[PDB]
């Protein structure tokens, strides 16, 4: 699909995504923190429609993601990210999408997710995270 | 004077400053890199006028600062940054200001200047740098 | 199990582990790189015996770990690390142990594993990794 890289920021204020309970994750966009002020990252859209939207609004700076978990699996012959769960120090967001396939888990004992990169076709193909102290 | 703090970025694309040949450094402004795009930093201004402007336009990313040196001294009963010099891997920009008082020098064998903070009154009072890999 | 924390170093030269084809990972020891010299880490031994030993000798510094994956599952009522696979830019070392239960995977796009911490009772209960540029 269409590759994307937001690069690095100072933190995360909000994650706006979309999912279809039948398939996978669709749209994905992040409102970062950049030196104490919000920075609206680019909107990474799905080629298709019919996704359920979700606003994951973080209580920044005191609330931060401590784990990103999910599932990867085949949807229409393609390998994609089917569901995502965001675990913070205060709440648990998700799962969003289909909890089927191969699970993955990225817990953090020290450091912060400071940015995202990935690819979107009909669905979120893959994703990577920028970590920093 | 008034304190400022630009925060941390991805690199340096340009330095805009002003100086007086009898006093010190006046205004200080940085055009940063933010994940492969210019980010115009705020212009930190002197409370007075009469300075000579200087534009240090850099060939980012191939050109980056390797050394920052200058002089600190007394002007009208105040310890201020009287002069600055920026040496990249490609050129020496400066000195700008008054080459008198206590010198200081920041050579960097590894890593980068990714941001500035400091204070400006009639002149540049002090400054600090953010360093990252 | 008995917790351990080798802390942070400059890279990895060799990993010495033990596994049982029916249970999980037992022993864990790293010969870390410290400022250009090998640094023999503490042997993290299991409470029991009957494990197959394996030495993972790296062509340091040219060869480094890009991914660590494996399986967590239940052995005698305990969730333990059953299997481990070390993937370098030159070779795939594994899987070692039982590839049963839930998978986990740490792929690295930038940075290096510079330390290990965790816990060992009868088997490797859990582990974490120190990541540095």
């Amino acid at each position: 699909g269409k590759a994307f890289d937001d690069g690095a920021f100072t933190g995360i204020r909000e994650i706006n995504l979309s999912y279809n309970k039948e398939t996978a994750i669709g749209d994905f966009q992040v409102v970062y923190d950049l030196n104490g002020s919000p920075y609206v990252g680019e909107n990474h859209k799905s080629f298709i429609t019919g996704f359920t939207p979700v606003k994951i609004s973080l209580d920044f700076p005191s609330e931060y993601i401590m784990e990103v978990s999910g599932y990867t699996g085949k949807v229409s012959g393609y390998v994609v990210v089917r569901s995502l769960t965001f675990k913070t120090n205060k709440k648990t967001y998700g799962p969003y999408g289909v909890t089927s396939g191969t699970p993955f888990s990225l817990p953090i004992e020290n450091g912060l997710i400071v940015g995202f990169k990935g690819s979107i076709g009909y669905w979120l193909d893959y994703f990577s995270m920028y970590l920093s102290l | 004077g008034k304190a400022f703090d630009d925060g941390a970025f991805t690199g340096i694309r340009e330095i805009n400053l002003s100086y007086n040949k009898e006093t010190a450094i006046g205004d200080f402004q940085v055009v940063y890199d933010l994940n492969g795009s210019p980010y115009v930093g705020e212009n930190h201004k002197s409370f007075i006028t009469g300075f000579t402007p200087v534009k240090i336009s850099l060939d980012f990313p191939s050109e980056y600062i390797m050394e920052v040196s200058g002089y600190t001294g007394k002007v009208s009963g105040y310890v201020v940054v009287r002069s600055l010099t920026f040496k990249t891997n490609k050129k020496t920009y400066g000195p700008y200001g008054v080459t008198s008082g206590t010198p200081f020098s920041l050579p960097i064998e590894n890593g980068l200047i990714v941001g500035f903070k400091g204070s400006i009154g009639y002149w540049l009072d002090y400054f600090s740098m953010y360093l990252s890999l | 199990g008995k917790a351990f924390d080798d802390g942070a170093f400059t890279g990895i030269r060799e990993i010495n582990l033990s596994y049982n084809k029916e249970t999980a990972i037992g022993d864990f020891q790293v010969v870390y790189d410290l400022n250009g010299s090998p640094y023999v880490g503490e042997n993290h031994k299991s409470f029991i015996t009957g494990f197959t030993p394996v030495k993972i000798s790296l062509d340091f510094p040219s060869e480094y770990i890009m991914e660590v994956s494996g399986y967590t599952g239940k052995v005698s009522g305990y969730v333990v690390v059953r299997s481990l696979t070390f993937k370098t830019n030159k070779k795939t070392y594994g899987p070692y142990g039982v590839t049963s239960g839930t998978p986990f995977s740490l792929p690295i796009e930038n940075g290096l594993i510079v330390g290990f911490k965790g816990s060992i009772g009868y088997w490797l209960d859990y582990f974490s990794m120190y990541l540095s540029l």
Partner: peptide
């Protein structure tokens, strides 16, 4: 090599 700051990057999870 360049005057671009670097960060630890983990992944990818999904395709490729």
């Amino acid at each position: 090599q360049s005057g671009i700051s670097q960060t630890v990057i983990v992944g990818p999870w999904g395709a490729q």
